Each structure stands twice: as structure tokens, then as C-alpha cells.
Amino acid sequence: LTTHNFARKTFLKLAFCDICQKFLLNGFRCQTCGYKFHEHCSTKVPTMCVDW
Numbered sequence: 001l002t003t004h005n006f007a008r009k010t011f012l013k014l015a016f017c018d019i020c021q022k023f024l025l026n027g028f029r030c031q032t033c034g035y036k037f038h039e040h041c042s043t044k045v046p047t048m049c050v051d052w
């Protein structure tokens with residue numbers, strides 16, 4: 001299945017790291033589900049991206 005996806009790219013306007021607590025900046029967002037976060041959430045992420 002298409003697991004998580006990571007493409008280093010800046011967003012369009014503004015976002016928010018659901019893992020941390022404040023906005024999201026040019027980091028890593030999954031372009032298949034629409035996930036977004038910094039390096040604190042590359043491995044700390046528990047359930048990988050397997051939504052549907």
C-alpha cells in the first residue's frame with residue numbers, strides 16, 4: 001500500500017505541526033494524505049500513514 005510520503009517542500013501560505021503545537025514551515029509533508037510536520041515527527045510518528 002502507499003505508506004507515508006515525504007517530499008521536502010514549502011507550503012503555499014501557512015500550516016501547523018499537529019505533532020508539536022505551532023505553525024508548520026518548509027518541512028516534510030505527505031503529498032498523498034496531506035500530512036505535515038518537522039524532524040520531531042519523522043520517526044516519532046506512531047501509526048504510519050495508512051489511512052483510506
Ligand SMILES: [Zn+2]
Pocket residue numbers: 003004005030031032033034035049
Ligand atoms: Zn502521509
Ligand SMILES: [Zn+2]
Pocket residue numbers: 017019020037038039040041
Ligand atoms: Zn513537528
